[PDB]
Amino acid sequence: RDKAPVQPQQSPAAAPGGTDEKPSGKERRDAGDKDKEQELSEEDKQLQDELYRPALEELRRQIRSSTTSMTSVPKPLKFLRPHYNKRFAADIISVLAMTMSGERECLKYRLVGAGEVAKEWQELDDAEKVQREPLLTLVKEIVPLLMEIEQVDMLEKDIDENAYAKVCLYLTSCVNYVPEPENSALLRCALGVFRKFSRFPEALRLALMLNDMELVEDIFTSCKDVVMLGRHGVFLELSEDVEEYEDLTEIMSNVQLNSNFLALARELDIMEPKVPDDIYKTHLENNRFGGSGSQVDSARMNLASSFVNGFVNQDKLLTDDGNKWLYKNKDHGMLSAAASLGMILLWDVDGGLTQIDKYLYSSEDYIKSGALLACGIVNSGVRNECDPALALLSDYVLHNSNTMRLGSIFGLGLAYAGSNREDVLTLLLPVMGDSKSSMEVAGVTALACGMIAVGSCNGDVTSTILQTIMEKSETELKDTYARWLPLGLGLNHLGKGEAIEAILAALEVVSEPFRSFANTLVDVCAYAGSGNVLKVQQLLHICSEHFDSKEKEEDKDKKEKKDKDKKEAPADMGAHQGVAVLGIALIAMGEEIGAEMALRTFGHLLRYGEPTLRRAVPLALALISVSHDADPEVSYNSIFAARLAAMLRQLAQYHAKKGTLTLCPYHSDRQLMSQVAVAGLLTVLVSFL
Amino acid sequence: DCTFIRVSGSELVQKFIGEGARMVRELFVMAREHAPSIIFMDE
Amino acid sequence: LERIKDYLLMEEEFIRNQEQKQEEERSKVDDLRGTPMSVGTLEEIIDDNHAIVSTSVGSEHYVSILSFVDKDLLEPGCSVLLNHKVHAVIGVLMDDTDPLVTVMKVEKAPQETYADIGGLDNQIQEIKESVELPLTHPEYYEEMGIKPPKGVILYGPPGTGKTLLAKAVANQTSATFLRVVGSELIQKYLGDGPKLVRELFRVAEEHAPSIVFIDEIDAIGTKRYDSNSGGEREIQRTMLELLNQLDGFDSRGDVKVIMATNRIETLDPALIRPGRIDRKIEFPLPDEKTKKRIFQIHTSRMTLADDVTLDDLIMAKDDLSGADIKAICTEAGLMALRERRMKVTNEDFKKSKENVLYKKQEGTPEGLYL
Amino acid sequence: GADREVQRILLELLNQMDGFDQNVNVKVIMATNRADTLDPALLRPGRLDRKIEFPLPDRRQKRLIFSTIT
Amino acid sequence: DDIQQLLKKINELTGIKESDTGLLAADKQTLQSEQPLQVAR
Amino acid sequence: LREELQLLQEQGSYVGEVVRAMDKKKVLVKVHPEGKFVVDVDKNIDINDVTPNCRVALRNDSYTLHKILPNKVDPLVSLMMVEKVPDSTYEMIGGLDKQI
Incomplete structure (x- = not known):
């Protein structure tokens, strides 16, 4: 219990009655009270009274923290300077100091911008290192680097409870919900504690997000300290971007410590175990050469059929299937079949010269130019296929070596990409200065220096892509130039973290929607994705723009932006009407594992009547699954059974059977409604192992 | 304040649940739609 | 609290819907x-652009x-759309979605996937290569050209997890x-x-391709009722229609025919024969080790201190189930909230242990022949 | 169909059987010989409280019946 | 809870301004010649 | 007002039953005895108030909707009247409180 002996103890203002009631209330504070603090309305008058007045602060924060207060609740603790693993400690530490210190860190982290919240914050950090429960105390102490000294404060014993838990939930919520400038603190102090820790591919994912060059030297003196070996060569090469294997091969070409990291981490290693084992552990049958190879001839689906048989790779059979298949083939299909031998051969350095050499310097411009194209396809570590085309390149309008400049300048964009590799670009100054009426000259100009130019140091607005900005706005002709030049512009904008290059090109470039389409291309390729919903509702606003191609690319940005929280990626784009919008979602599925909701959207997107959008479905439909697979194939046989429809059928047989290298070439494939010359640039889309 | 239900044995009661068509499980419909539902039954 | 986010996303999904x-x-x-589009019913179709229909009367x-x-x-x-003037067929009507579909066609992948198991992963492999591999990747059947297994029999003690496996395959589904x-196959009529x-x-x-699961199928052969016209010479004919249906023609x-019993002995060996059901699957009470896995699953999302060993609940009772362990968890929660606590201590597992095991853990009326 | 009409006549009888007036004395006296084929939802308080059979007579009752009829 | 609740609030905020962002002759004359045809009971 | 009684001398209407409305501003009505009829809406009504098993006032000539009718069915009230369980409260089962 009864409150009859103990309720009127608040009624005298005597100090000894307080100084023996408050340790007694501390003893009864293990359950708080008998009840939900029905003393509040009588002891709020005691606010004005002041020996053990910090114990009066403990009573006051106990009762105000017992009912409710967002700023007056932690005030007796920040005036108290907390003084005097339990149930009592679970009360005034694990829940009262957690909610109370949480609203103090939130209300002052949003209010002022002191050190009292740093002392109490490290006091709760220490107190929850006593309680030892992560992943709620952690996500509460994020919003007060502070997190850096928290990680070197807490990371002593629990390696995986902050490694597997905190870095996954907090990296996932840090690309999902937290904005950018704290992810750098995640990456750097994660480099600290993960530098103190083993299992180095967590630091290599820190290389995927940092793109740091000190990390690769530390992880290679440390990953030579940890002697599988070629396997971390393999996902080293698949994990890395285009810059840090050239920076890596120059700092390791200096030191290299065994030279076997020069062997692994440029080329030839990430591919020497695979292709013989690709022959060994797997066995493919001749009845897709014969069945999918007996899908009928019209010299267009023979072209695409030889393209399907070009991606059979139980050997290099289609490299040496006789003659008169390419003799039936036309010019950019002669690029396709002169490059098909390289598309069978993404290995065999020495064999590439002696298989392509029959088709080098031949009687046909597309045999030789597609042959040097295949020389760009086969490898990325030769630099001896540079000069037989690199010496020929100069034509100044419309000669053979401009097509060999297509396949060879693009093939050297495939083969090499430095930190900023520039002699090929000084060769590119008479290429963009050449400006042939063939589109793919400036096409593979922007795409080639853009493949060198991805992963750049937050991009640049240097004179290379600035030169193709001014020489782009030189001529407003053949609007595929106004589409495929901001391709490579935005590729140079890639490597951004914080680029205001969208504002720089938004001051230089913008005009009538060719160059406002350049504006929306930089808007796409400079904004790869974070928690940045402001441009997602801006995306919703300029989604309704009357120009229906900045709709196409600007809304096409979605599969780049929200590729991780992919529950949001299904939208009502099929429920929209601007049919290229159904194209946009039809891009936004992608090449991944392809869930039943994705294939359920391919049920309706499979059934559409235009040959361009009907041509747009089987690419991602069979690309997302690279019977089960052949059931939509025979369903397309039921859809048509023009040559566009037989060509999408061959496209589906083809595709059936954040690394930038798999991010570029489909965005290079986004202007499909055009010539078989552009279908000569269809055979460039290398993104598979 | 739950809907008190008593479904004992009658074709009347089956006609008020469904029409006596196949089963009783439209009582699940009238119980989810009256989700504070207390049902009582006999021997 | 996140109730603002839950109710906000709920009202947002409601208004957006x-x-x-x-x-x-x-x-x-x-x-x-x-403007009055009437509704008709087809009888036959004559090819000369007009057919015979049927009115309501x-x-x-x-x-x-x-x-x-x-x-x-x-x-x-x-069901079609008819005119009132020349009564011409106006167009196709969407069909009547009956209580057979709205009750039986479960649209929901109901509960947890294959992390809800204990003592499994052989039977998961059997339901995987027997159902899921003919479903998801039937390309090995192209590699050799061999028929899939047809039917599955689940059998064992009650509360084993036939329900758990049925809702796991009902989770991982595309059919x-x-x-x-x-027990639903006997009614107060003749020929139902x-x-x-x-x-x-x-x-x-x-x-579509479909997954038909029927549970407690032994309740037609060993059950009798006064709420039954005819009797065993209608039950036998129902077993004959299931017989010709399961081994029909064309x-x-x-x-996928997936069926579950408790006992196996009182069933038709003409239904046990392969051709109807090729995967008869033993369900034992697995092991005392994955007991701890079922304790880990059924206590994985509840506040609980250490206070116990699971071996104390292993060397306690010979048979083992999610029905046993789950009743230890729920009854331990009833003791914990009965003692108005969180972080459930040992004595709730003690009185929960004795309450559950006595609860059914007994026999007949003592002595017998111990 | 004919069973549904007798069913709804029983619905009319039951629905106008519980709640007549509670003051207006309508004395409904129903008679059968059979007590088997009956809904117990009829045989309810408020509907029908007393259950009266006419048993077979005995010696002296049949003597009095004979003294009346003869 | 913050990842799922925050991402769900992000998707709901995405659908909200999307909902706000929202705002033959094959046989026809022969059928018109079949209006002078007959019901044929 | 008395000259305005030919309004009361106008043709009456039908009571219908709305299962549910379908697309393009039409509804489905079964009347007192007949089949189902996809019939037309009016302007001064609400598609947002299309309720399942809702009676509406239905015009008899052109089968246009007129007014929504309340007091629909009461099925659980009807079965409650079929049962007539004794309405009980706390104060009448004295003599034991443990099971309570």
């Missing part, structure tokens, strides 16, 4: 349509289709799922069970 001329020839077809007419919707959508026994309780079989597997056949199709 509630967010649901130029074409002249379409308006001309709308003028071909009457049965006035029957030789009327034509508005030929922009397809007449291949029309089948004998489909239209159906569930039937085997076979009609339920015919329309049942007809509905299982018409839509390309049965991608309908």
Whole structure:
């Protein structure tokens, strides 16, 4: 219990009655009270009274923290300077100091911008290192680097409870919900504690997000300290971007410590175990050469059929299937079949010269130019296929070596990409200065220096892509130039973290929607994705723009932006009407594992009547699954059974059977409604192992 | 304040649940739609 | 608290779900349509652009289709749209979604996937290569050209997790799922069970590849009722319609027949024979080790201190189930909230242990022949 | 169909059987010989409280019946 | 809870301004010649 | 007002039953005895108030909707009247409180 002996103890203002009631209330504070603090309305008058007045602060924060207060609740603790693993400690530490210190860190982290919240914050950090429960105390102490000294404060014993838990939930919520400038603190102090820790591919994912060059030297003196070996060569090469294997091969070409990291981490290693084992552990049958190879001839689906048989790779059979298949083939299909031998051969350095050499310097411009194209396809570590085309390149309008400049300048964009590799670009100054009426000259100009130019140091607005900005706005002709030049512009904008290059090109470039389409291309390729919903509702606003191609690319940005929280990626784009919008979602599925909701959207997107959008479905439909697979194939046989429809059928047989290298070439494939010359640039889309 | 239900044995009661068509499980419909539902039954 | 986010996303999904001329020839077809579009029923189809229909009372007419919707959508026994003037067939009507579909066709992948197991991963492998591999990756059947297994029998003690496995395969699904309780096949009429079989597997056949699961199928052979006209000479005929249905004719199709019993001995060996059901699957009470896994699953999302060993709940009782362990968890929670605590201590598992094991853990009336 | 009409006549009887007036004395006296084929939802308080059979007579009762009829 | 609740609030905020962002002759004359046809009971 | 009684001398209407409305501003009505009829809406009504098993006032000539009718069915009230369980409260089962 009864409150009859103990309720009127608040009624005298005597100090000894307080100084023996408050340790007694501390003893009864293990359950708080008998009840939900029905003393509040009588002891709020005691606010004005002041020996053990910090114990009066403990009573006051106990009762105000017992009912409710967002700023007056932690005030007796920040005036108290907390003084005097339990149930009592679970009360005034694990829940009262957690909610109370949480609203103090939130209300002052949003209010002022002191050190009292740093002392109490490290006091709760220490107190929850006593309680030892992560992943709620952690996500509460994020919003007060502070997190850096928290990680070197807490990371002593629990390696995986902050490694597997905190870095996954907090990296996932840090690309999902937290904005950018704290992810750098995640990456750097994660480099600290993960530098103190083993299992180095967590630091290599820190290389995927940092793109740091000190990390690769530390992880290679440390990953030579940890002697599988070629396997971390393999996902080293698949994990890395285009810059840090050239920076890596120059700092390791200096030191290299065994030279076997020069062997692994440029080329030839990430591919020497695979292709013989690709022959060994797997066995493919001749009845897709014969069945999918007996899908009928019209010299267009023979072209695409030889393209399907070009991606059979139980050997290099289609490299040496006789003659008169390419003799039936036309010019950019002669690029396709002169490059098909390289598309069978993404290995065999020495064999590439002696298989392509029959088709080098031949009687046909597309045999030789597609042959040097295949020389760009086969490898990325030769630099001896540079000069037989690199010496020929100069034509100044419309000669053979401009097509060999297509396949060879693009093939050297495939083969090499430095930190900023520039002699090929000084060769590119008479290429963009050449400006042939063939589109793919400036096409593979922007795409080639853009493949060198991805992963750049937050991009640049240097004179290379600035030169193709001014020489782009030189001529407003053949609007595929106004589409495929901001391709490579935005590729140079890639490597951004914080680029205001969208504002720089938004001051230089913008005009009538060719160059406002350049504006929306930089808007796409400079904004790869974070928690940045402001441009997602801006995306919703300029989604309704009357120009229906900045709709196409600007809304096409979605599969780049929200590729991780992919529950949001299904939208009502099929429920929209601007049919290229159904194209946009039809891009936004992608090449991944392809869930039943994705294939359920391919049920309706499979059934559409235009040959361009009907041509747009089987690419991602069979690309997302690279019977089960052949059931939509025979369903397309039921859809048509023009040559566009037989060509999408061959496209589906083809595709059936954040690394930038798999991010570029489909965005290079986004202007499909055009010539078989552009279908000569269809055979460039290398993104598979 | 739950809907008190008593479904004992009658074709009347089956006609008020469904029409006596196949089963009783439209009582699940009238119980989810009256989700504070207390049902009582006999021997 | 996140109730603002939950109720905000709920009201946002509700209003967004509630967010649901130029074409002249379409308006001309709308003028071909009457404003009172009446509804008819097909009997036969005559190829000369007009067929025979049936009225609500049965006035029957030789009327034509508005030929922009397809007449291949029309089948004998489909509801159509009729005019009042010449009573012409206006167009295809969406079909009547019966209580057979709205009750039996479970649209929901119900509960947890294969992390809800204990003592499994052989039977998961058998349901995987017997059902999921004919479903998800039937390309090995192209590699060799060999038939899949047809039927699955689940059997064992009650509370084993036949329900758990049925809702796990009902979770990992891409086929239209159906569930039937085997006690539902006997009614107060003559000739009802076979009609339920015919329309049942007809509905299982018409839509898509489907997964038909029927549980407690032994409750038709060992149960008798006064609420039954005829008797064993109607039950036997229902078993005969299930017999010819399960081993019928004319390309049965991608309908996975999955059935569950408790006892196995009182069943028809003409239904145990392969050809109907090729995967008869033993369900034992697995092991005392994955007990701790079922304790880990059933205590994985509740506040609980250490206070116990699971070996104390291993060297306690010989049979083992999610029904046992789950009742230890729930009854321990009843003791914990009975003692108004969180972080459940040992004595709740002690009185929960004795309460559950006495609860059924007994026998007959003591002595007997111990 | 004919069973549904007798069913709804029983619905009319039951629905106008519980709640007549509670003051207006309508004395409904129903008679059968059979007590088997009956709904117990009829045999309810408020509907029908007393259950009166006419048993077979005995010696002296049949003597009095004979003294009356003869 | 913050990842799922925050991402769900992000998707709901995406659908909200999307909902706010929202705002033959094959046989027809022959059928018109079948309006002078007959019901044929 | 008395000259305005030919309004009361106008043709009456039908009571219908709305199962549910379908697209393009039409509804489905079964009347007192007949089949189902996809009939037309009026202007001064609400598609947002299309309720399942809702009676509406239906015009008899052109089958246009007129007014929504309340007091629909009461099925659980009807079965409650079929049962007539004794309405009980706390104060009448004295003599034991443990099971309570």
